[PDB]
């Protein structure tokens, strides 16, 4: 009930009573009126220097409204009827010194139509004087407006829209909202008004449900987030927040050692491969091979990597066609591991925390384990303090980090300042929870992003959350945090559009539990659809990163496209085969060479593979990495099915002579079909027979029927070959 006090405190400031001789009846009447307004919009008004004056008679007769031009003397009531300031009871003055003027009365309780107007004036203060300073209302509110105009019942419009909007043909776009700022603000206010005045609220909910709902959720929840964003722009607020935190960690800081500071700094800027050293620990024979390798000839060395290697040879020459060699690609594979940057946070993201993964040389594995085990000990003090309650921290992120495939079309191709609503809704779809397996580095007060960062997180730390303080106003958080996504919306900031993500920190065990129960649910369901034994572990969720929930909700959808595009009898025979060898359908966000289904079956470490998908015969499992973008694959489904092709290529070649488990794609008959039709499909498909078979099997089962035709009229002998194997497997 600190409630009533919050309002008393705030009101004694902004509220000025200046009447004749009833300064207790009138001074108590105002308290009754403003009490209906959300405590938070009053503080936001105080924030921008606004004040409320309760006066008698003609309100024009006040010092604050003298500078009023002989035009702004005529206002419109909530119903759109022209009036005159010297004949009205309220007025909110714009400008850098906001003013609210209210006449005196107590019949505000009785004569509701005036309270309605007074609130409408406040709503105006809210949408025009306050929210405008943080670029609101925006897309979310525009969506309410578009729901109303394009709904069947035109009553919602007849109650909130001025004819200007009523007669507008198309929907209200961001562009419209910019040219008609005054108009939208008006609608906002009216809706705020009806919602706030206890008697008209029913009307609102009766003829404009979406507006009621928006204003309902906004005044009870979302508004304090507005105050939050509003305070974030105040220099002194920003400085005040930073100081309380700097104080809370003052002891922890003064105690840090050169060694501790060395660790935190190394954790902010990775150490690049020092060319020189590479050359040394190389080899007399190897140097010779390196002395000439058209790095470009290979295909597993990114553009960034190839360049580095190029400069490696060109730096050892200072003294005295393109066939793809074997032991040469072996040499280039080894070096790939060797020329990666020392990046602790990157190591955590790739392994999802599983720092013992055989994915890199043992020497480097231990250095990572040592440094991490140490950072974990440094970041022991939690954010919780007596100096502050709820606390928000910020992080600017690149969407490619969550979903490179959607990241491809997030920014509008025409106007780089706009975000594609199409991809936005998709991205937002199943984004319910997130996980952090590395050390998040956030800002105390929000800061401008880098061009490729169109994601602006606003995170509500738990008092329990441990962290470390940095001098530049940032905090390094402890690994293994849990995050519940609370809201995802398009916002405009500094002349550009971003995706604001409102998230709350929770115990990681809470999120893991959801995933685990998902795995149980998804397997129950699919074990029934495939007729597998009740409790078999078929599908598995290896989720550890920031897009966490999507990896899970996505698997369901991928498997649906997988059953509606392939013959049920083929699936069953093939997956029974897989299950027989302990196979697994692994959906993950950690890089593939860290899923055991692949590494516990590797000869050498450098023989690892990372990509959108992968099939491992030795384990009979299919691996699908979520975050990436399959080069020739348009989406996750496709990718999965492509890998199921390799699985079929397996069971088929197995049914030829189980006395030899081999690939039916290795058959002499097929090596010829590839010799001829091997270049009529996808580029990727041309890589080799196993892949060509897989890309072909894929198109044949695409959702795009047109795509099925392409194989049948460009790969005849193949369309038939793949169909023989199907019927083969199906019957045998």
Ligand X SMILES: Cc1cc(N)c2cc(NC(=O)Nc3ccc4nc(C)cc(N)c4c3)ccc2n1
What are the residue ranges of helices labelled H in 27-138?
A: 27-34, 39-47, 112-124
- In angstroms, what is the minimal distance from the CB of 623 to ligand X? 9
Closest CA to 500 of 390, 628, 397: 397
- In angstroms, what is the minimal distance from the CB of 691 to Zn ion? 5
Indicate the residue among 555 and 694 with the shorter CB distance to ligand X. 694
611 interacts with, out of ligand X, Zn ion, none, CB within 5 to 8 A per kind? ligand X
- CA dihedral 642→646→651→652, nearest 10 degrees, is 90
Indicate the residue among 225 and 663 with the shorter CB distance to ligand X. 663
- In angstroms, what is the minimal distance from the CB of 700 to ligand X? 17
- In angstroms, what is the minimal distance from the CB of 403 to ligand X? 18
What is the C-alpha separation between 299 and 142, in angstroms, rounded? 48
Q: Strands 481-493, 433-436: parallel, antiparallel or unpaired by DSSP?
A: antiparallel
Indicate the residue among 233 and 688 with the shorter CB distance to Zn ion. 688
Closest CA to 505 of 453, 563, 544, 466: 466
> Tokens representing 658?
């189980």
Q: Is 642 annotated as a binding residue?
A: yes
Angle between helices 689-700 and 716-731 (to 10 degrees): 80
| Residue 649 makes contact with Zn ion by CB under 5 A | no
Show Cβ contacts of residue 436 under 8 Å, excluding neighbours closer than 6 positions: 477, 479, 480, 481, 483, 545, 546
643 is catalytic: yes
Show Cβ contacts of residue 518 under 8 Å, excluding neighbours closer than 6 positions: 541, 552
Which DSSP symbol is given to 410? S
Q: Is 646 annotated as a binding residue?
A: yes
What is the C-alpha separation between 617 and 634, in angstroms, rounded? 25
Q: Is 695 annotated as a binding residue?
A: no
- In angstroms, what is the minimal distance from the CB of 299 to ligand X? 5
15 interacts with, out of Zn ion, ligand X, none, CB within 5 to 8 A per kind? none
Indicate the residue among 353 and 645 with the shorter CB distance to ligand X. 645
Choosing from 312, 379, 499, 694, the residue that interacts with Zn ion (CB under 5 A) is 694
Indicate the residue among 396 and 621 with the shorter CB distance to ligand X. 621
Burial of 131 (0-12, 13-18, 19+ CB in 10 A): buried
What is the C-alpha separation between 674 and 694, in angstroms, rounded? 12
What is the C-alpha separation between 437 and 28, in angstroms, rounded? 55
Query: Considering CB under 5 A, how many residues would be counted as binding Zn ion?
Result: 2
> Tokens representing 566?
């392939």
- In angstroms, what is the minimal distance from the CB of 349 to Zn ion? 25
- In angstroms, what is the minimal distance from the CB of 693 to Zn ion? 9
Q: How are strands ordered across the β-sheet holding 99-103?
A: 15-17, 51-55, 99-103, 90-93
What is the C-alpha separation between 60 and 352, in angstroms, rounded? 66
| Residue 691 makes contact with Zn ion by CB under 5 A | yes
- In angstroms, what is the minimal distance from the CB of 694 to Zn ion? 4
Binding mask 213-242 for Zn ion (x = CB under 5 A): ------------------------------
Active-site position among 643, 677, 689, 695? 643
Point out which residues bind ligand X (CB under 6 A): 299-300, 609, 611, 614-615, 617, 643, 646, 690
> Tokens representing 144?
């309410």
Long-range contacts of the stretch 652-655 (C-beta < 8 A, 24+): 652/725, 652/728, 652/729, 654/577, 655/728, 655/729, 655/732
Burial of 246 (0-12, 13-18, 19+ CB in 10 A): middle
What is the C-alpha separation between 628 and 650, in angstroms, rounded? 26
- In angstroms, what is the minimal distance from the CB of 267 to Zn ion? 36
Indicate the residue among 664 and 673 with the shorter CB distance to ligand X. 664
Q: Is 547 annotated as a binding residue?
A: no
What is the C-alpha separation between 287 and 280, in angstroms, rounded? 9
Closest CA to 404 of 593, 634, 622, 588: 634
Gyration radius from the chain CA atoms? 32
Indicate the residue among 301 and 440 with the shorter CB distance to ligand X. 301
Q: What does the DSSP assignment read for 366-392? A: HHHHHHHHHHHHH---BS--SS-SS-E
Closest CA to 278 of 315, 317, 235: 315
Indicate the residue among 188 and 615 with the shorter CB distance to Zn ion. 615
617 interacts with, out of ligand X, Zn ion, none, CB within 5 to 8 A per kind? ligand X
Residue 499 main-chain phi, psi, to 5 deg: -105, 110
Indicate the residue among 133 and 629 with the shorter CB distance to ligand X. 629
**DSSP 3-state assignment of 88?**
coil
Indicate the residue among 571 and 609 with the shorter CB distance to ligand X. 609
Q: What does the DSSP assignment read for 586-618? A: EEESS-GGGSHHHHTT-SSGGG---SSEEEETT
395 interacts with, out of ligand X, Zn ion, none, CB within 5 to 8 A per kind? none
- In angstroms, what is the minimal distance from the CB of 617 to ligand X? 4
What is the C-alpha separation between 217 and 187, in angstroms, rounded? 17
**Residue ranges for the binding site?**
642, 646, 684, 691
Residues recognised as catalytic: 643
Which residues form the interface with Zn ion (CB under 5 A)? 691, 694
**Residue ranges for the binding site for Zn(2+)?**
642, 646, 684, 691
């Amino acid at each position: 009930k600190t409630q009533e006090e919050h309002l008393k405190e705030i009101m004694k400031h902004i509220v000025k009573i200046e009447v004749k001789g009833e300064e207790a009846v009138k001074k108590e009447a105002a308290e009754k009126l403003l009490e209906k307004v959300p405590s938070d919009v009053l503080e936001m008004y105080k924030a921008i220097g606004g004040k409320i004056y309760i006066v008698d008679g003609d309100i024009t007769k006040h010092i604050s409204l003298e500078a009023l031009s002989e035009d702004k003397k005529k206002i419109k009531d909530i119903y759109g009827k022209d009036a005159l300031l010297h004949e009205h009871y309220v007025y909110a003055k714009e400008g850098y010194e906001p003013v609210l003027v209210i006449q005196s009365s107590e019949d505000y309780v009785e004569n509701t139509e005036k309270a309605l107007n007074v609130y409408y004036e406040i709503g105006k203060i809210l949408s025009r004087d306050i929210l405008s300073k943080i670029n609101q209302p925006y897309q979310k509110f525009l969506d309410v407006l578009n729901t109303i105009k394009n709904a069947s019942d035109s009553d919602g419009q007849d109650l909130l829209f001025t004819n200007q909007l009523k007669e507008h043909p198309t929907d209200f776009s961001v562009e419209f909202l910019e040219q008609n700022s005054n108009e939208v603000q008006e609608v906002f206010a009216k809706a705020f008004a009806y919602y706030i005045e206890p008697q008209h609220r029913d009307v609102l909910q009766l003829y404009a449900p979406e507006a009621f709902n928006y204003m309902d959720k906004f005044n009870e929840q979302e508004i304090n987030l507005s105050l939050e964003e509003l305070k974030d722009q105040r220099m002194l607020s920003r400085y005040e927040k930073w100081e309380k935190i700097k104080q809370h960690y003052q002891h922890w800081s003064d105690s840090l050692s050169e060694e501790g500071r060395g660790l935190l700094k190394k954790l902010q800027i990775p150490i690049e491969p020092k060319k020189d050293d590479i050359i040394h620990s190389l080899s007399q024979e190897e140097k010779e091979l390196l002395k000439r390798i058209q790095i470009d000839s290979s295909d597993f060395l990114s553009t960034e990597e190839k360049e580095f290697l190029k400069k490696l040879q060109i730096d050892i020459r200072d003294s005295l066609s393109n066939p793809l060699s074997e032991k040469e690609k072996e040499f280039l594979k080894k070096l790939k591991l060797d020329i990666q940057p020392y990046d602790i946070n990157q190591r955590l993201q790739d392994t999802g925390g599983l720092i013992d993964s055989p994915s890199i040389n043992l020497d480097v594995r231990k250095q990572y384990k040592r440094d991490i085990q140490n950072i974990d000990a440094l970041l022991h003090q939690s954010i919780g303090s007596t100096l502050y309650n709820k606390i928000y921290l910020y992080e600017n992120m690149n969407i490619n980090n969550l979903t490179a495939t959607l990241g491809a079309d997030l920014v509008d191709s025409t106007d780089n300042t706009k975000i594609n609503r199409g991809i936005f809704n998709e991205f937002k779809k199943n984004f319910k929870y997130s996980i952090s397996s590395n050390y998040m580095i956030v800002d105390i007060n929000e800061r401008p992003a880098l061009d490729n960062e169109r994601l602006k997180w606003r995170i509500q730390l738990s008092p329990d959350t441990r962290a470390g303080y940095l001098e530049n106003g940032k905090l390094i958080l402890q690994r293994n945090i849990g995050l519940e996504i609370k809201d995802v919306q398009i916002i405009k900031q500094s002349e550009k559009e971003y995706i604001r993500i409102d998230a709350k920190v929770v115990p990681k065990s809470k999120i893991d539990t959801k995933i685990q129960e998902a795995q149980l649910n998804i397997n129950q369901e699919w074990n029934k659809a495939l007729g597998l034994p009740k409790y078999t572990k078929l599908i598995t969720f290896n989720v550890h990163n920031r897009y966490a929930s999507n990896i899970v909700e996505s698997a369901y959808l991928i498997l649906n496209e997988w059953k509606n595009n392939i013959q049920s009898d083929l699936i069953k025979k093939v997956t029974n085969y897989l299950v027989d060898g302990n196979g697994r359908f692994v959906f993950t966000d950690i890089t593939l060479p860290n899923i055991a289904e692949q590494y516990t079956h590797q000869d050498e470490i450098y023989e690892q593979v990372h990509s959108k998908g992968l099939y491992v015969p030795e384990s009979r499992s299919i691996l699908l990495h979520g975050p990436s973008k399959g080069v020739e694959l348009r989406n996750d489904s496709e990718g999965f099915i492509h890998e199921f092709g390799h699985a079929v290529d397996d069971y088929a070649g197995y049914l030829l002579d189980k006395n030899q488990s081999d690939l039916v794609t290795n058959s002499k008959k097929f090596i010829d079909i590839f010799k001829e039709e091997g270049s009529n499909l996808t580029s990727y498909g041309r890589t080799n027979e196993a892949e060509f078979f897989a890309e072909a099997f894929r198109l044949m089962h695409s959702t795009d029927h047109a795509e099925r035709l392409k194989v049948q009229k460009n790969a005849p002998k193949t369309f038939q070959f793949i169909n023989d194997q199907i019927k083969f497997i199906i019957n045998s």
